[PDB]
Enzyme design. Structure first.
Site, mmCIF file in Angstrom:
data_model
loop_
_atom_site.group_PDB
_atom_site.id
_atom_site.type_symbol
_atom_site.label_atom_id
_atom_site.label_comp_id
_atom_site.label_asym_id
_atom_site.label_seq_id
_atom_site.Cartn_x
_atom_site.Cartn_y
_atom_site.Cartn_z
ATOM 1 N N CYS A 34 36.252 33.377 39.342
ATOM 2 C CA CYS A 34 34.950 34.028 39.169
ATOM 3 C C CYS A 34 34.408 34.485 40.517
ATOM 4 O O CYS A 34 34.095 33.662 41.383
ATOM 5 C CB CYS A 34 33.945 33.101 38.475
ATOM 6 S SG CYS A 34 32.288 33.884 38.033
ATOM 7 N N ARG A 40 30.052 33.730 41.570
ATOM 8 C CA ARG A 40 29.563 32.362 41.658
ATOM 9 C C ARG A 40 28.375 32.170 42.602
ATOM 10 O O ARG A 40 27.790 31.081 42.587
ATOM 11 C CB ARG A 40 30.705 31.446 42.071
ATOM 12 C CG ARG A 40 31.649 31.122 40.940
ATOM 13 C CD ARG A 40 32.748 30.202 41.420
ATOM 14 N NE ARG A 40 33.847 30.954 42.020
ATOM 15 C CZ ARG A 40 34.863 30.404 42.671
ATOM 16 N NH1 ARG A 40 34.906 29.090 42.823
ATOM 17 N NH2 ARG A 40 35.838 31.169 43.168
ATOM 18 N N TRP A 94 26.384 38.937 33.769
ATOM 19 C CA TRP A 94 26.304 40.390 33.727
ATOM 20 C C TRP A 94 27.567 40.972 34.337
ATOM 21 O O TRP A 94 28.267 40.314 35.110
ATOM 22 C CB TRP A 94 25.072 40.934 34.458
ATOM 23 C CG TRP A 94 24.940 40.427 35.827
ATOM 24 C CD1 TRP A 94 25.624 40.848 36.935
ATOM 25 C CD2 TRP A 94 24.072 39.383 36.258
ATOM 26 N NE1 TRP A 94 25.229 40.123 38.033
ATOM 27 C CE2 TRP A 94 24.266 39.226 37.645
ATOM 28 C CE3 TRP A 94 23.129 38.579 35.609
ATOM 29 C CZ2 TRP A 94 23.566 38.282 38.391
ATOM 30 C CZ3 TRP A 94 22.435 37.650 36.348
ATOM 31 C CH2 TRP A 94 22.661 37.503 37.728
ATOM 32 N N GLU A 99 35.187 45.879 35.976
ATOM 33 C CA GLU A 99 35.691 45.328 34.724
ATOM 34 C C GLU A 99 35.637 46.366 33.611
ATOM 35 O O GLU A 99 36.595 46.519 32.843
ATOM 36 C CB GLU A 99 34.889 44.101 34.322
ATOM 37 C CG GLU A 99 34.890 42.990 35.328
ATOM 38 C CD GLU A 99 33.997 41.863 34.847
ATOM 39 O OE1 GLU A 99 34.470 41.030 34.044
ATOM 40 O OE2 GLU A 99 32.811 41.837 35.245
#
Ligand code: HEM
Ligand code: HEM
Ligand SMILES: COc1cc(N)nc(CCc2cc(CCN(C)C)cc(F)c2F)c1
Ligand SMILES: COc1cc(N)nc(CCc2cc(CCN(C)C)cc(F)c2F)c1
Ligand SMILES: C[C@H](O)[C@H](O)[C@H]1CNc2nc(N)[nH]c(=O)c2N1
Ligand SMILES: C[C@H](O)[C@H](O)[C@H]1CNc2nc(N)[nH]c(=O)c2N1
Ligand SMILES: [Cl-]
Ligand SMILES: [Cl-]
Ligand SMILES: [Gd]
Ligand SMILES: [Gd]
Ligand SMILES: [Gd]
Ligand SMILES: [Zn+2]
Lengths: 401, 402
Positions: A105, A108, A277, A282
């Site tokens: 991730c 973070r 969000w 992506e």
């Protein structure tokens, strides 16, 4: 040993001492690295003890007062019943830690600000649906997105499990044809056929939002049509390419992962959907341009009049950039929270600096942190990283069949 | 054996070759260190020699034959009497190609069987070493129709120092530490630049000054040699549609020739064995010109392009970088100097992976180095799971001689 880690843009060196705590072992050996691979009982007390020790360390309350206290109730709870329930703030603290520990991730830096909805008393598919529905409306928040996770009951032996059959709360349909190939999202061809199998009349669109196949323990799934005004979507347009909107492309506001398993102190929550969000790559690079997804790259290059006859024109790169520009422009005009990959990676670098002084390092999966376009133009490309598993954690789990 | 998926196609294979991995990498079940740039007696020399000879007699379809057993015997005898052994010429050629074939960070390996091997194991001096190098550059450059080549200087052996090329590549641009602490030219080469000046080189003061070579013969200080200008083929950078781009005065050189790595064959070590191919355009356009710790031109190109450089969400960095790579590709094609773009290179690497799956049961590959530094998921290698391990013969990093 303590791995030496170098940042090649600046020349700075740090040591990851936190790596020495690595609980679950990963897929690599001295003989071969498998880092690129996507998918690699009263010892419950061991992981419950350690998680409780984490909790009271984080509030400067180790070796005093209720620390020993809470150690005994979980001792008694498991000695008596065979499992244990988490205190309210522990569920909260464990949810944030598992986010903090997610090596893949890049978002973070936000880990401290997470809204934890406790749904541990849920007990039917109709109940899940209103729990999920509160989450979606809270997280969406008219486009001012807020990180949230809903935690359904912790699995217990001898009896079934809560599961969301969809990989995400918002998915687009994918339909095969009289010739095989897919109209809609190819990543969702399977769940699309399970929704058709269990009722749902198929639409005829490239962006038909799928229903929700929600499953209470020891019960077959149950379809739930999602309220259209609850699913915030963004039509995609480009600031200067006026024909881009006519491509009819869309994506949704809320990335809500609903197929992963949350693990805190040895407890296992096979249903715990979490949402944040989007980072623009992506949507623009992976969801729309991957050859096995919507695969629109050549179509956008045709409209841009690019030379698709030679790879060395870099027509793929030019069209991909404009698709990402359209995603960012469209979400900003819609007033829907989004972050571009340069801003996201710069914040992750600040996160690495925080986690260094706070915990002595940070588990990070380089291949997933570096964005799928413009990799070396972001600072994380030049940062060496150490990948390992910490608990609490989000884990992948088998599909519920 | 590890199962390996291609996510674009759904393909699945298993890497049985990894089970033969000779030396050990830096990863453990505790922790993966895959992203780290630098991840690192007679009986054990015999063991590597025996394995390599086995590899050689396998490739010529003569496993377990008469010649095979004789060579094994000859090598043991030589190791017992001298502490080392000598490669036959055909074994050296095979070993150099295998080392390239085994290089996990090389995306160019579809070409591994087409490698010209120059045998310089009779080299006796730094002056002779320079002549060998100049002929390597001349042959490989080939007036812009580049050809892969390696020149192999004498192996490491007991009693004598090593042959070493101090320069990390045969062609490098100087990096001059400046008045304020900045760098004029290539910041990657500040150290070797200071070494050349310290060894008598009269420095320039441009941004693209080609460095002299510092060549070390056994047990000798390094000796400075100037490369003749007409041997160093260079490419002025221009853009097909941005005409102010030529006024930046950017250039790059034709020949990527790595000169500081160690070639290991059957337990023998060649600390001097420069090898050369042709460039992939992202190496120049993205890494060498746009890295913040290199020439770092990205912001100045974006300003000239009139992009909005005050918000990241305009993607000014991505747009400027793309046009810098376009300029590299156009310029090299215009000058008729071999170059490959990252799409064609990664496509050919996918074919290499398939060839190697059938030939050897797998292919060692370092995903983070194979995936190009721009447009990663637009190339097929992004969606290919890979298995990284060390086979021998091999090219290895070695410490700098100073
Ligand atoms: C708030 C803004 C956030 C951003 C911008 C963000 C960004 C990302 C991105 C780009 C990925 C890579 C996705 C991929 O696998 O391709 C990822 C993965 C992940 N994120 Fe985040 N994220 C955010 C919030 C969160 C939250 C709230 C959680 C959980 C509480 C979370 C947990 C995870 C996990 C577990 C993964 C791994 C997914 C996987 O392995 O497939 N993230 N995130
Ligand atoms: C013929 C065209 C070639 C192409 C297009 C090519 C491509 C590349 C690229 C893009 C890299 C990564 C460089 C970096 O980012 O630092 C690389 C690394 C490497 N290449 Fe190739 N290469 C070619 C020829 C060769 C040859 C002829 C050899 C050896 C005989 C070779 C051996 C290596 C090695 C050992 C590395 C790893 C160096 C390191 O670890 O930093 N390559 N190659
Ligand atoms: C919860 O908050 C988030 C915010 C943002 N922006 N992204 C995510 C990850 C979303 C996510 C996406 C995918 C599929 C996409 N690729 C694999 C092609 C798989 C995951 F396993 C996953 F988790 C979460
Ligand atoms: C010999 O043929 C080749 C052809 C092509 N195109 N590239 C190479 C790699 C050249 C190379 C470059 C670098 C430095 C750059 N990085 C730090 C980004 C390190 C290497 F260790 C290396 F080897 C070799
Ligand atoms: C094969 C490869 O590991 C796979 O495509 C990974 C690489 N890195 C990734 N990084 C992100 N963020 N998301 C992904 O799906 C992947 N996929
Ligand atoms: C820290 C990180 O591993 C490092 O910057 C790597 C990543 N991938 C790379 N890939 C290539 N081809 N060349 C490189 O120098 C690097 N650098
Ligand atoms: Cl997604
Ligand atoms: Cl280079
Ligand atoms: Gd037109
Ligand atoms: Gd122009
Ligand atoms: Gd200027
Ligand atoms: Zn690893």
């Amino acid at each position: 040993k303590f791995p030496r880690v170098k940042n090649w843009e600046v020349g700075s060196i740090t040591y990851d001492t936190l790596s020495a705590q690595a609980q679950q072992d990963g897929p690599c050996t001295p003989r071969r690295c498998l880092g690129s691979l996507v998918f690699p009982p009263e010892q419950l007390l061991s992981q419950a003890r350690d998680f409780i020790n984490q909790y009271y360390s984080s509030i400067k309350r180790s070796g005093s007062q209720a620390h020993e206290q809470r150690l005994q109730e979980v001792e008694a709870e498991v000695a008596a019943t065979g499992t244990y329930q988490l205190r309210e703030s522990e569920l909260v603290f464990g949810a944030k830690q598992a986010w903090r520990n997610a090596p893949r991730c890049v978002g973070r830096i936000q880990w401290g600000k997470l809204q934890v909805f406790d749904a541990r008393d849920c007990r039917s598919a109709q109940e899940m649906f209103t729990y999920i529905c509160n989450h979606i409306k809270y997280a969406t928040n008219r486009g001012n997105l807020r990180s949230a996770i809903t935690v359904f009951p912790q699995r217990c032996p001898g009896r079934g499990d809560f599961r969301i059959w969809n990989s995400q709360l918002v998915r687009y349909a994918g339909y095969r044809q009289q010739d095989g190939s897919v109209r809609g999202d190819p990543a969702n061809v399977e769940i699309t056929e399970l929704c058709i199998q269990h009722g749902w009349t198929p639409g005829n669109g490239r962006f038909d939002v799928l229903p929700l196949l929600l499953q209470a323990p020891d019960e077959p799934p149950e379809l739930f049509l999602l309220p259209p005004e609850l699913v915030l979507e963004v039509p995609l347009e480009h600031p200067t390419l006026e024909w881009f909107a006519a491509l009819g492309l869309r994506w949704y506001a809320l990335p809500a992962v609903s197929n992963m398993l949350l693990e805190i102190g040895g407890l296992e929550f096979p249903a715990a959907p979490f949402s944040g969000w989007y980072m623009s790559t992506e949507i623009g690079t992976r969801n729309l341009c991957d050859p096995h997804r919507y695969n629109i790259l050549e179509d956008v290059a045709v409209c841009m009049d690019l030379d698709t006859r030679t790879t060395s024109s870099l027509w793929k790169d030019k069209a991909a950039v404009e698709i990402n520009v359209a995603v960012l422009h469209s979400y900003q005009l819609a007033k829907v929270t989004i972050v571009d990959h340069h801003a996201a990676t710069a914040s992750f670098m600040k996160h690495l600096e925080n986690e260094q002084k706070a915990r002595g390092g940070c588990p990070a999966d380089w291949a997933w942190i570096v964005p799928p376009i413009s990799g070396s133009l972001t600072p994380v490309f030049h940062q060496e990283m150490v990948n390992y598993f910490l608990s609490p954690a989000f884990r992948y789990q088998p599909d519920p069949w």
